[PDB]
């Protein structure tokens, strides 16, 4: 009856930038998703491919908690088939998504007067990010023909831009922490079940 340590994911004191989103494996465990779904802290609980009411009924081989911090106006980019600068460039979900997305406002945790520049996002990369891919590489984005030897300038923009997370920003610009539960079941025995 070892309950799943969702506290180390949802209640973590320091989340990760959306480009370098953390991924925690959950298995050898029992997880009650009804507590998360019936929690008032979460502003968004969008389940794709499954239904949250039946989450405790099903079992999967393992769960992946993909934790990051995005902008409010940007939370709608964590749905399957969405496009933009987070979905296409930072964290892509396949249209055949079997999981859930859990977004809660975290202004009082990840904002700072003057800007919480500790959170970043990837404006620049060659191709759209493959679903469930992350790229932590900070390589100068050559947008032009001329190789410029890795100096930040025209057609050599730094690929990562910072998030301006101030407590006075409008809700669409406030830091929302997002945890994506990706559910995987296969020939390996279903190990993470729900009460």
């Amino acid at each position, epitope marked *: 009856t070892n309950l799943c340590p969702f506290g180390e994911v949802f209640n973590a004191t320091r989340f990760a930038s959306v480009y370098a989103w953390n991924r925690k494996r959950i298995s050898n465990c029992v997880a009650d998703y009804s507590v998360l779904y019936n929690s008032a802290s979460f502003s968004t609980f*969008k389940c794709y491919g499954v239904s949250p009411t039946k989450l405790n009924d099903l079992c999967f081989t393992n769960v992946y908690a993909d934790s990051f911090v995005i902008r409010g106006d940007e939370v709608r980019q964590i749905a399957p088939g969405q496009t933009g600068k987070i979905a296409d460039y930072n964290y892509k979900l396949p249209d055949d998504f079997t999981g859930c997305v859990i977004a809660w406002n975290s202004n009082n945790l990840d904002s700072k007067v003057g800007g919480n520049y500790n959170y970043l996002y990837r404006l620049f990369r060659k191709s759209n990010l493959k679903p469930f891919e992350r790229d932590i590489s900070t390589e100068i984005y050559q947008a032009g023909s001329t190789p410029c030897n890795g100096v930040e300038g025209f057609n050599c923009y730094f690929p990562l831009q910072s998030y301006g997370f101030q407590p006075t920003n409008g809700v669409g610009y406030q830091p929302y922490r997002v945890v994506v539960l990706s559910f995987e079941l296969l020939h390996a025995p279903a190990t993470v079940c729900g009460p």
Partner: single-chain antibody
Amino acid sequence: EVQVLESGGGLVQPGGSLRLSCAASGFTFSSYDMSWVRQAPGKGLEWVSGISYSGGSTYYADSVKGRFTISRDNSKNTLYLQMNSLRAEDTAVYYCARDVNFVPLVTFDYWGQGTLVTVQSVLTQPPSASGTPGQRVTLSCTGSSSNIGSNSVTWYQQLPGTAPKLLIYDDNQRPSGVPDRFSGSKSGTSASLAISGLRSEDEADYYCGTWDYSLSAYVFGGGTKLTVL
């Protein structure tokens, strides 16, 4: 198809009760917030109430606070509004609107057809605005720092005799199906919509809707019947 049917509207009497039920299919009804919105005959939209994804948090307009109960049964994926101790001002048409995003950035995309129930606006949107074909008309919403400044401004175009349709969300963007002609704008505590070039299909009522972190309600705009000359 993300259609949301709705029923339970008919002739009732003041001081009675009425159960409105709307059933949503084609999407995970138990994951999206929903709401009940009201339109008096020949009057702007008035947001009745709203219930979260879990059904735990419920929000009500202060004009209907304390007498309407919004409820949600996810097993049958249906959603109910229990109207109790009705008044004469509640005779209107009711819609249940799917909320694309969390609160406060409320975004009502899909709306019910409308149930005819027979028994002031915070956002001081102009009563009307006259335009001409090919013109660039800016119809400007107006609110406080709690209405416009902090939460997303969403613009709905209601054709005469139809359910409202989302045009602008998150103050800038457009849905998949809205021409780029419409452009959102927001500055401080004042939002606006810019229509560059007008046609015969832009004859509609345009409403600005924003959540409130203080009033805890999704206030709508007033009218602004755009007329093409």
